[PDB]
Amino acid sequence: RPMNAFMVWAKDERKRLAQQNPDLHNAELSKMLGKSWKALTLAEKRPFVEEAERLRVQHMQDHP
Amino acid sequence: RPMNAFMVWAKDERKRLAQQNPDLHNAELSKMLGKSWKALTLAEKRPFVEEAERLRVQHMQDHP
Ligand SMILES: [Zn+2]
Ligand SMILES: [Zn+2]
Ligand SMILES: [Zn+2]
Ligand SMILES: [Zn+2]
Ligand SMILES: [Zn+2]
Ligand SMILES: [Zn+2]
């Protein structure tokens, strides 16, 4: 049940937005994140994509 | 074309939210405002309601 590329990338983007806008609702936070991720190119998402692949390998190996 | 009670009340509530959350989109800003206003009771909206009535009078008198 590891995080996918988006979750991996969002984890940091979320804190930066939430630890700055106490009034910014979570639902909207998720919506902004959803769209910013979409606007990104593969070249910009690549590292988050590789990290999700790394995490998936460890899970499938049962976390040695 | 004077502001109604909501606009009158929002004018201040908007600046306080926008001059604090550069990342908070306008569409969402309007949505939050729309709902907070709704949650308010007449007793809390009264002064903004009176101001809108004052403004309407001046307009109907053609702004003397
Ligand atoms: Zn909201
Ligand atoms: Zn790869
Ligand atoms: Zn696992
Ligand atoms: Zn938005
Ligand atoms: Zn009155
Ligand atoms: Zn007028």
Written description of the protein model:
Two copies of one chain form a homodimer. The first copy, chain A, has 64 residues and is mainly α. The first copy, chain A, has helices at residues 5-18, 26-39, 42-60. In chain A, helix 1 (5-18) packs across helix 3. The longest helix of chain A has 19 residues, at 42-60. Chain A starts with a helix and ends with a helix. The interface between A and B is small, with 8 and 8 residues. One zinc ion (ZN) sits between chains A (25, 27-28) and B (28, 31-32). It is classed as transcription. Keywords: transcription.
Name the descriptors.
binds zinc ion, DNA Binding (I), subunit A, homodimer, Transcription factor SOX-17 (chains A, B)
Cα end-to-end separation of chain A: 15 Å
Provide the number of structural domains of chain A. Answer: 1
CATH topology of chain A: DNA Binding (I), subunit A
Shape field of chain A: globular
Name of the CATH homologous superfamily of chain A = High mobility group box domain
Radius of gyration of chain A: 14 Å
Binned strand content of chain A: under 5%
Classify the oligomer.
homodimer
Identify the CATH architecture of chain A: Orthogonal Bundle
Count of runs of 4 or more consecutive helical residues of chain A: 3
The most extensive interface, with participating residues per chain, is: A-B, 8 and 8 residues
Helix percentage of chain A: over 70%
Strand count of chain A: 0
Ligands bound, unique: zinc ion
PDB class: transcription
Keywords: transcription
Assembly: dimeric
Entry title: Crystal Structure of HMG-BOX of Human SOX17
